Structure 1
Amino acid sequence: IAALPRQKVELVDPPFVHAHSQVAEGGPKVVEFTMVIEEKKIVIDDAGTEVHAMAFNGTVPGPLMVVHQDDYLELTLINPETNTLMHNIDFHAATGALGGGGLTEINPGEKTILRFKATKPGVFVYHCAPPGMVPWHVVSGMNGAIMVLPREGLHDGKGKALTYDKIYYVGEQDFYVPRDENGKYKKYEAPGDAYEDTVKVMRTLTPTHVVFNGAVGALTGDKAMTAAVGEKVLIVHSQANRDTRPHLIGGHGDYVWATGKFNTPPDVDQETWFIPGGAAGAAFYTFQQPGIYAYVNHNLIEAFELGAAAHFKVTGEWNDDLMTSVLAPSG
């Protein structure tokens, strides 16, 4: 262990992923990561709705950390003195101490370094879990995911290699924002001030917002994910507290590790997949048609009314064999 190569990796904010190789380069190594926890107010919709976010590395969701099976993930978690809450981290990819949550409880002004062997391959969720207030921190955006790639990269049901040209991390967040008697969303001074009202909303099990990358439309318009005809894309998706059902309108999930675990054969030709709360999944797809696509949570109410919708701008040539308008909309 002590003789293993140590490698520091620079993280990038989602939906983008930091530099990495699908197939492992070299032997096992201790991959070092560092994340600063930021408690800050963020606007989650076009109506100026604020949320006292608790974010790993300052983003909702936290950045995607990529390592290979049997590598060690050594994370340095820092909680600035400017924060008002104690935080920790639970890596679903880790084994022991509640995923590491019991070994990383840091108060404002403290940091900690946790190391764990990524023994299982797949996309895993990680989240803050302070004893007594687990749901609150998580639904406040304090969660993300990591990808433990098999040493030999991805493969389909029959060992055939699956290599993606691009990879996007879509973190889905269910928010529970309190509203006053008039139906208007409330704003609070400090995070703690919202606790009571937030819990009452949480118990209804009905989120007020279900978003991608921290806000409604965060992945639409000019911030739409891109691709080209013939391009192979891996779309990692996560939900740390509630179920979701990803769907690529106009496309499919050619290979979908619905459970997120690479040793579990992927489903194929998926129209809509399911990811349970507290888990991550990965869908592989080769775009065949150009144009705009809508990647959504297929409970269309949560998608188009609550905000769980994203876009894909794909360049290339249209394929009239696959689809064609024989007669355009006419009288």
Structure 2
Amino acid sequence: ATAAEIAALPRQKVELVDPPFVHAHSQVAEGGPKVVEFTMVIEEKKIVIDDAGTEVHAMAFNGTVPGPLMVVHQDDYLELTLINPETNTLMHNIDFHAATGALGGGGLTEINPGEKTILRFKATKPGVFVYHCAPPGMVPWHVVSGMNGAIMVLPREGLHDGKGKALTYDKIYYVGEQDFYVPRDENGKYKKYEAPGDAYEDTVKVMRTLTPTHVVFNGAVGALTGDKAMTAAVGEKVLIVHSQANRDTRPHLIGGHGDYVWATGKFNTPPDVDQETWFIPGGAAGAAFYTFQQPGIYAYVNHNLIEAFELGAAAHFKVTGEWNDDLMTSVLAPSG
């Protein structure tokens, strides 16, 4: 690419949507390389994360935890306008694991309250990748305050199985998983603070135990359950992108599988197949492809079941369609 060629490329503005939903995109790329433009506004705000009204001073790309999923194709350029409003109190930046150089972009995007920056990078490697804020000297605090998200760099040809056959999903969800480290007082009750900075020393004491107090999808216990369950129909092909910026996880679809799982997140490494539970190390995204076969409620968990059912790491899928008694049947229903 010449200087002539790079400036000549199409620009395309893309509006983000909140997770677990993903902005519209084409799986197979349309036309040649382009510069895909995205804007995100940073919000520091108090969120409630559990049923006892536990508060976090969230630090949120686009106001959500996780940050939204950005979608591009291989050798496109991602050009992000990152804005830190005058209402915030901390400097922030962004590290895309999908980018090369300057600490993922962190070294170039350090913006105080009241400033903006525009970073462009070439998306040379196909896959799902974490991005997170990373101010020097304070990185784990920003990240565990929920300032992280993911992107997906689709291959220009869309996705393929290990023998090169097309894998085309009908829909795509993004589950961002968050470990929170909320300080308690002597009596075991979670503390509240006036400004984010007040909580700093207390939170580090918690971080250093390496034991989160909460492990949550979409920013809170139960954000993806009940009426906010994810949805599919028997016969639909669903891609579930899962990210964890700081800590290991082990996703599992209770009553399903991952028919094809890029556990490492990278689309040039052939997927694993038929998975019960896959493993995503902290600081990575992964993706699982699954065709639903049975209707009903499913759970989708971090299969450390303490983390899933005590600490908040559980979602639902609501699936419509016809039951298949060949796959499974109750021969004799509970009886005595």
Category of TM-score, reference length = shorter chain:
over 0.9
CA distance in 2, matches of 1:317, 1:273: 28
CA distance in 2, matches of 1:215, 1:265: 33
CA distance in 2, matches of 1:177, 1:50: 8
Deviation at 1:247, TM superposition (A): 0.1
Deviation per residue, 1:260-283 (Å, 9 max, x gap): 000000000000000000000000
CA distance in 2, matches of 1:77, 1:71: 19
Deviation per residue, 1:21-73 (Å, 9 max, x gap): 00001110000000000000000001000000000000000000000000000
**Alignment partner for residue 317 of structure 1, among 322, 328, 335?**
322
Deviation at 1:299, TM superposition (A): 0.2
Deviation at 1:324, TM superposition (A): 0.1
Deviation per residue, 1:120-145 (Å, 9 max, x gap): 00000000000000000000000000
Deviation per residue, 1:249-304 (Å, 9 max, x gap): 00000000000000000000000000000000000000000000000000000000
Deviation per residue, 1:136-180 (Å, 9 max, x gap): 000000000000000000000000000000000000000000000
Q: Secondary structure at the match of 1:94?
A: coil
Counterpart in 2 of 1:197?
202
Deviation at 1:14, TM superposition (A): 0.1
Structure 1 residues not aligned, in runs of 5+: none
- After TM superposition, the score normalised by the length of structure 2 is 0.98
Deviation at 1:111, TM superposition (A): 0.3
How high is the sequence identity, in percent, across the aligned residues?
Answer: 100
Q: Secondary structure at the match of 1:100?
A: helix
Counterpart in 2 of 1:20?
25
Counterpart in 2 of 1:102?
107
Q: Secondary structure at the match of 1:202?
A: helix
- After TM superposition, the score normalised by the length of structure 1 is 1.00
Deviation at 1:330, TM superposition (A): 0.3
CA distance in 2, matches of 1:139, 1:13: 19
Q: Secondary structure at the match of 1:75?
A: strand
CA distance in 2, matches of 1:116, 1:109: 24
Deviation at 1:319, TM superposition (A): 0.3
Counterpart in 1 of 2:161?
156
**Alignment partner for residue 5 of structure 1, among 6, 10, 33?**
10
CA distance in 2, matches of 1:53, 1:159: 42
RMSD: 0.2
Deviation per residue, 1:232-261 (Å, 9 max, x gap): 000000000000000000000000000000
Deviation at 1:119, TM superposition (A): 0.1
CA distance in 2, matches of 1:54, 1:307: 20
CA distance in 1, matches of 2:75, 2:171: 24
CA distance in 2, matches of 1:19, 1:268: 27
